[PDB]
Amino acid sequence: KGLNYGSFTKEHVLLTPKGYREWVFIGASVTPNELNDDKAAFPEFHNVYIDPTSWGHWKKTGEFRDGTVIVKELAGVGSKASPSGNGYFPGEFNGIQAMVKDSKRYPERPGNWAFFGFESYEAKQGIIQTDETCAACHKEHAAHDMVFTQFYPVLRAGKPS
Amino acid sequence: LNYGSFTKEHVLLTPKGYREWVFIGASVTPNELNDDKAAFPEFHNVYIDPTSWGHWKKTGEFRDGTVIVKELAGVGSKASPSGNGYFPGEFNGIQAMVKDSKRYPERPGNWAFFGFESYEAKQGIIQTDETCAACHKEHAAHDMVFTQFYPVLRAGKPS
Ligand code: HEC
Ligand code: HEC
């Protein structure tokens, strides 16, 4: 069996994940401010991680086990040009978002996903989000099980046939 | 333990499982911002082997036997529910660099660079210094690696 990644409070709120940068990377996207009227909803680079246990489970099944934790880490754009050419390059770390799939802890959320915001990296836990703030966009547009796997080529290529 | 596999000529065998290594940052040079032909199209996802990553959290240096994999991927779309920008598509190929003072003692920084003809290739191709190391030497922030673009490495090192 596999470890339980993610620690929770007695009210089932995920404590601020540490060590996620050593989980399994599944994809990176970028919404720069300048392309979104100098205020993107989520600045700017986004680096996404799934915990190792649920990555083993995904390789075997193409499905997110209960106990999946997915962390989106946000970063500024640092430059627009490099010796490799024109585009977008990351600067400093900005913040994180996370989501947890758990039928037991979250029996009445869409998909059993609890979406967590964090007010800082120094914060002890996150704040669980209403269905209008987070999960509604994810159920409408995400390709599989409310996860935007159409932007996670590690996922698509890592599921079996 | 070491994470490369080699032939007798110190040629690196096409790495398997590098997506299970430690991701250290991502950038994007789209073709539309580069005269419809980027040098390295388009998204770049960079990884360092876990053993070298452990030594980096200790020393902030690249130990001998360090392997870094840059995986390339197309721009799949330029808009999504999160807004305008660039979003990944399909996997294009890989590049790799390897640090070894004893096997590459004449390469700049003991770093051999490897190109790969496709995902199905068995071994890379090792590159002359002008093809790759020339530009890494001139411009990379640390020991030929563009750590100005790897915040996981910068946040990770012991300052
Ligand atoms: C990425 C995200 C992730 C990573 C996992 C995933 O399924 O992609 C998490 C844990 C998370 N968000 Fe998010 N979200 C949206 C899109 C399009 C992407 C991937 C593309 C990209 O990287 O830009 C996401 C969409 C939306 C959205 C539509 C406007 C809203 C309102 C939200 N998301 C809201 C939230 C959260 C509330 C603050 C929250 C904690 C999220 N998402 C977590
Ligand atoms: C990224 C790269 C990496 C990842 C580690 C790093 O040092 O960033 C590898 C293993 C690799 N490339 Fe190089 N490359 C260049 C730049 C600016 C970056 C980081 C930011 C980004 O993703 O865009 C790189 C630049 C250049 C360059 C300047 C004109 C040249 C000539 C090369 N790269 C050449 C090569 C290779 C020759 C075939 C090769 C195997 C590389 N790079 C590998």
Smallest Cβ–Cβ distance between A45 and the set B26, B38, B39 belongs to B26
How was this one solved? X-ray
Residue B36 burial class via C-beta count within 10 angstroms: exposed 0-12, middle 13-18, buried 19 and up: exposed
**Considering only CA atoms, which of B159, B158, B146 is closest in space to residue B48?**
B146
Dmax (CA) of chain A: 50
Q: Which of B72, B152, B153 has the most A C-beta neighbours within 10 Å, making it the best mutation to test the interface with A? A: B152
B78: closest CA of chain A, how far (Å): 9
Give me A98's structure tokens: 């996370």
Cβ pair A28:B156 closer than 8 A: no
Which residues on adjacent β-strands are paired with residue A143? none
Contacts of B143 (CB under 8 A, 6+ apart): B61, B62, B109
Separation between Cα atoms, residue B71 and residue B85, nearest integer Å: 20
Number of separate domains in chain A? 1
| CB B113 near ligand 2, within 6 Å | yes
Separation between Cα atoms, residue A112 and residue A64, nearest integer Å: 11
Residues of chain B contacting A32 with CB distance shorter than 8 Å? 85
Residue type, B115: G
Q: Which of B16, B21, B23, B72 has the most A C-beta neighbours within 10 Å, making it the best mutation to test the interface with A? A: B23
Pairing of strands B43-48, B67-80: antiparallel
Q: What angle do CA B31, B37, B43 make, to 5 degrees?
A: 45
| CB B148 near ligand 2, within 6 Å | no
CATH at residue A42: 3.50.70.20
| Termini Cα distance of chain A | 23
Binding residue per annotation — B149? no
Domain interval for residue A92: 1-161
Residue A31 alpha carbon to ligand 2 centre in Å: 23
B62: closest CA of chain A, how far (Å): 18
Residues of chain B contacting A44 with CB distance shorter than 8 Å? 85
Binding residue per annotation — B40? no
Residues of chain B contacting A140 with CB distance shorter than 8 Å? 81
